[PDB]
């Protein structure tokens, strides 16, 4: 969805990818805080008793049982971190029937989007380009280096295929709320998949870097109903 | 004719050292004016500074990268602490190839030249720091900029190789009577173990950016996939130098904070060969992950598992040293001057900047955070708050002994807090912004990222403050510094103990662990005539 | 690499529309060389090698 | 005399009190050219990295 | 340490060097053909004769320093045995790292030989582009080189049981078996069909085997080096530490070219 | 000659131009360079 | 009822630039032989008209017309 | 460039150990062509003498004032690292004895007295 100005956290979901990507960093997060607390002790300690001691305790250098928690017991959190990671990068993916192929190819300094099927018998392909909106000819109340003038539309609770390239340099292909970042290099194709579970707008940026006008090429996704993208195909 | 021959002209090792921090101290005054020009820029929504140009934007981030990169931190960490200190615990008189570091030296001279003439004869160079090929080809940057550029990466790589093969081939034969390599401080060790990552390392970088050279000028097509090559392939063989490179910027720093930590806590450090041991296992699981900079590159479902497995297992050998430290801390009296404060400020911010590693370290996980501004948070912690704590620390701490003239305290704990505090001002709300989800290097930004890029503006004016500060504290140093030491008992090295009398301490005051602080302070020309005896 | 000798000799008075056909990725000139003509590179001898346009 | 000048030129290069690279009477033949042209080589790349940051092309 | 007269004498076996010029000359040849290099590639000189005093005062100042080695090990006599052995232990880590520059060369080959991108139709080597025949001057290489690897064991062999007509004529034999490698392999880039810009494939292989060519240069030269030393009674028969980095070098040059064969000239599919 | 100040590459006392001058233009210079390229590549493209 | 290209096992990782070209050639063979108005070759014809980018097809077609195309396509 | 050595008995400096030559068509020997600090070497391993020492400190008996340990040095200083008198049980402290006063070693207690040679 769109950026919120004094922002903490992240963006909501539209996709049970993106929902994993929460819930994995949710439970990484309560192991860190466990870590920094344990050492934040550990030195609030060691400045309340034993600054500006008498006693030193010179002879405490060697250890054989306290050596061993230090090593083994981050190993097991890292094998219960490893579990749900291995199972949400395995399991959630295109497993059955894609329903359909978008191919975004990345040009110089905007995006061009061909929707590959629906053809006719003379190759009569809908396609079109996508630009950005300069600011002096907005219109009042759009955002500023995110409003394109046409945008992806697409079906709701349906599989969508991505097919990303390019044609000049490397790009990057994101929509933040829909958990899809994937590259877009010259010479071949890459395939991402995406379900969308609510009607709105998804708004994204590119990320990697292509010459002077990489902040302004912006990517806009409607989610219509089916009855919508029939009549606005049926248009286009 | 006598200044010619003994400051250009060199043999010593100690007088390359003192023009390793002169040369360091002006590379990274310069990158740090272009970051305050890029941080004033990312201020407000609009075009502020720069009028319309985002070229001289992306060139000022590159030129930023290089400068303190290969500019300052490596010829301070290798030049002014390496150079001098390891003959002087090894117990030699001077390096095996004297030669050879007279022209490690002079090498950076003629590429800091190319890389200021890589800003002036064109557009520029806004290829970023890794100089990805289909951008950086003849069809967006064709000009005398690029070329001039990774020329600049060629001399830097000579002079790393030429004085690691000196490291490694005098520590092995150039030792006192009585040491094995199991005596050996923990300095010398870090030393031997960047040296060994720079000669396996740096002939990919070489080979990469050779063939870069050669695809943009005798056309031939290694990288272009229009005549049967893959970009892909250099940043395999780049990124083999790069994760190598980063623990290059950080090994030297982790044997530093243990002399302050065996010094001003009067205690050994806790498992010495469990220390050696962790700096081999970091050095060598460096090498074999080099792909977690690429996880959207394309690559199988197979290959980001492993790459997932073997970048946390790091996590491992890093915390035998983070607690290895508590526990030599722990029991001992501690005093607070002006080295421990550094110290004491290096083991909090380089695990909460650690800490963010393990959550990209994940193949799911990067899918969110890639080109994002939580990675320049995560490594602006390590880099700005682990590697240039360590130098002012180790600045601090050998100062009064290679100088021979002291410095006011209480600057210096000025200097201190202004740096804590502006810099921890500006990298914390990088991490909210790459939540939010802002992508790197973007000159202008929608107008919801505004109001904490209002607040990261805020802290680059309070640490530029502190570089002048410590530029005062310098001129305060050379300046009337013979009359700085009877103003506060920071200038003792070790502090009198509880049965221990002043007037016993006054005839035996220096008690050491190492050669260094026994030596007449200034260190002489010649300083070992006879050998020195171990047990 | 004597009786080799004389089947080059005769593969330079043939005429441009009798050479090997030339695919693409095979002359590949995007920036011109500075030696000479930027047609040529180092070692190049006429009788195995041309440049047809 | 005979090609055993080594008992000779090693009572020559010790007591000498000039350094060793200027030290023979045949080192002229080698140090003049190579400091002659290398202050050519030098002085001609300061020129033309001066000349080129104002746009002079040749 | 307790010997009558010891004060006359260093106290330590290491070599304390004197004040040399050349560490600064060095650079300010590398300047110079640093940025001659990136200026005559895009204009600005035109006249080519600056870039070829670059590289003649750069290989100037490599032979003024090894003038100035020399010297202080056969005349003023500092090179004691753990000076020599740290010599040793240094030239072994400049082989290792001339080893790897190579290993990131043949990366580059199998990252594209096996796995072929569409543009050129999936084959090794491409249509269009014949290849060099490995039953031809590719075999008179090797030979020579192995060849060469077994004279210079009669020449190090005959400094140690103190016969010179022996080591003089082997030191010659092997400077001619290097020299019409070369004169080969110029033969073997002039009646080729293919050339650097034909192909990845046309890339890479005038790039593995062309670090090689300046590399066996080098011996040509270091070899020069060693049967004119032996020729003015430098070498003695237990002190002589160029030939034995020569061996060194010559050896792991056969080797790396017994893999740029095996690799590149039969290995096609 | 050994002692405090002698292991220096600039000399620092019994000095003709006192020492503050040659201290403040190393900073100087090393905090006006990136303006002055700037400044230049600015000029070069239009923009004032 | 939006119905696109399924799993095809023999592919089945993130790179689908050898299925494009590999249904290419597929259905140039069969339409080499076995005439032009076949059923099975326009399984072939929506396979890769629904993975390619359509630039990529038109230069194939000027190399093919201009008989300079690397390619099996000779059976 | 005076007369050559036969024995280190006879040799006063670097000014004696040039030696003689060698013959036309012969492989020079060492003892026919070297001088400097490494035929010294030469002349000291062709007797037993060994001219750098590598023998460590003396870790069988321990300090006192009355009777110290003797660390001999052709310096006023010598630098001297105890580690203990079972030669591993104090930890490694560096001391600098002195012709004007001795070191005692704040853990253990050992004496260094310097004999000047
Ligand atoms: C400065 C040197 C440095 C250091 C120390 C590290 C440390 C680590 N880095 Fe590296 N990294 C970089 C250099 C460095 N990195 C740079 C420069 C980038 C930016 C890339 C660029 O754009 O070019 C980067 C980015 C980067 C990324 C993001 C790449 C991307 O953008 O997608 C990743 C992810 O895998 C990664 C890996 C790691 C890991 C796992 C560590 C770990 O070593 C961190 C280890 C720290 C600890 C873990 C603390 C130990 C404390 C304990 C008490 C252990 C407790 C045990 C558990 C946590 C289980 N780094
Ligand atoms: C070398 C590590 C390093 C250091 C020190 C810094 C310093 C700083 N960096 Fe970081 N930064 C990087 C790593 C580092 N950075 C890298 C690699 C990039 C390039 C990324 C890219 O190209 O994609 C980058 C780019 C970069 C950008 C541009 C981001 C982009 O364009 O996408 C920004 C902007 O906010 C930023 C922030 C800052 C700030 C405010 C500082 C301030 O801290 C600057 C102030 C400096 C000081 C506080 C220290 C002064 C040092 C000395 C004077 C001490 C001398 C030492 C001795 C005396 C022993 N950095
Ligand atoms: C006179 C000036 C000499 C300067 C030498 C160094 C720079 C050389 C750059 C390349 C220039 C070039 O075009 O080289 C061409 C040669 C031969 O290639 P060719 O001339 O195209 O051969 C075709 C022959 N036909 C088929 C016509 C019969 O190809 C070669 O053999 C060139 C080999 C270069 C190898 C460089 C390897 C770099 C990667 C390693 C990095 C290490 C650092
Ligand atoms: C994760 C852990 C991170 C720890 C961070 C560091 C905390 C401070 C540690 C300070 C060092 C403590 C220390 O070295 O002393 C040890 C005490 O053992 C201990 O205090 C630990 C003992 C562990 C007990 C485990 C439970 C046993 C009871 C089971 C009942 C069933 C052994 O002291 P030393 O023997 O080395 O002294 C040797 C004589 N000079
Ligand atoms: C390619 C760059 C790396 C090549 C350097 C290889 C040097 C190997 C030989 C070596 O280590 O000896 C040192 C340099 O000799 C030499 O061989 C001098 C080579 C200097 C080449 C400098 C790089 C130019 C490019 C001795 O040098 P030393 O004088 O300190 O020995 C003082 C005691 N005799
Ligand atoms: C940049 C190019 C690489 C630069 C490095 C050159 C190769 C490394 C030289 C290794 C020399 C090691 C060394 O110190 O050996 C001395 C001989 O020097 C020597 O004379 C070795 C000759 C080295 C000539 C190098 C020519 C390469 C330049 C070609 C560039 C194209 C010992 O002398 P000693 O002890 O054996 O004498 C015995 C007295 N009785
Ligand atoms: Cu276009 Cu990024
Ligand atoms: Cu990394
Ligand atoms: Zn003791």
Redesign the pocket.
Known sequence: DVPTPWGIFFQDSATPNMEGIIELHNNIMFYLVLILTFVSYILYTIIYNYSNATIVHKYMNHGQLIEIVWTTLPAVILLIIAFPSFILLYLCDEVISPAMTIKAIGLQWYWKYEYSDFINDDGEIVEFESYVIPEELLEDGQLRLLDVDASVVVPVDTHIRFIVSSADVIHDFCVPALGVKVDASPGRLNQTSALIQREGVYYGQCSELCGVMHSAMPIKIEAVSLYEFINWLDEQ | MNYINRWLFSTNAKDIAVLYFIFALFCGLLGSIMSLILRLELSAPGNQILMGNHQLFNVVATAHAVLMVFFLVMPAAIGFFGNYLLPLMIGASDMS????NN?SFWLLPPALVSLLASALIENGAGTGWTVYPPLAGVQSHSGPSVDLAIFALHLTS?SS??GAINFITTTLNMRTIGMTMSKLPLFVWAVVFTSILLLLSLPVLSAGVTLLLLDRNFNTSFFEPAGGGDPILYQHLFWFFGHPEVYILIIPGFGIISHIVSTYSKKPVFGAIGMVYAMGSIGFLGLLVWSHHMYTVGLDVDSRAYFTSATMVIAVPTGIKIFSWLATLYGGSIRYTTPMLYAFAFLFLFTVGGLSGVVLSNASLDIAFHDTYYVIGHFHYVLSLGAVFSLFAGYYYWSPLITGLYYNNNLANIQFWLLFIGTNVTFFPMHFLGLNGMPRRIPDYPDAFAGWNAISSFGSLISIISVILFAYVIYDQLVNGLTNKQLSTNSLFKNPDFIESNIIFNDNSIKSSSIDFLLTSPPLPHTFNTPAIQS | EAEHAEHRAHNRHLSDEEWPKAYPYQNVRRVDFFWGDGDKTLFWNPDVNRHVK | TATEKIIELQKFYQSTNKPIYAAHPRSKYYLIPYFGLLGVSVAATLFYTGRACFGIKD | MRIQNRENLQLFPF?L?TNSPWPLT?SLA?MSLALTLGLTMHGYIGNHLWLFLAISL?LSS?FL??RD?VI??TYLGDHTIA?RKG?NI??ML?VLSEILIFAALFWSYFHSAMGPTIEIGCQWPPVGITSIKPTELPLLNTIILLASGATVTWAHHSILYKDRQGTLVGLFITTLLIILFVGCQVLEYTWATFTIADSVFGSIFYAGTGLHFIHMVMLIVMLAICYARMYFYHFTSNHHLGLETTILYLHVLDIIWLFLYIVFYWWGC | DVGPYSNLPFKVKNRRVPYAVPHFLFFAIGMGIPFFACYVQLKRSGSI | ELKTVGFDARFPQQNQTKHCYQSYLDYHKCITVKGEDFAPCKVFWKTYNSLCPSAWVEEWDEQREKGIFPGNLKV | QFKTATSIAEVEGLENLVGPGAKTGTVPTDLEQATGLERYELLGKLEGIEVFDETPLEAVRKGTMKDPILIDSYDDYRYVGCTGVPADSHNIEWLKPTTEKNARCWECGSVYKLNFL
Do not use: S
Request: proline letters at 0%; hydrophobic letters at 75%.
């Open positions: 190839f004297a030669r050879l022209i000579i190789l030429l | 070599h060097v060095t590398l750069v490599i320093w090894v080695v202080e090990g000076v010599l240094g030239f400049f």
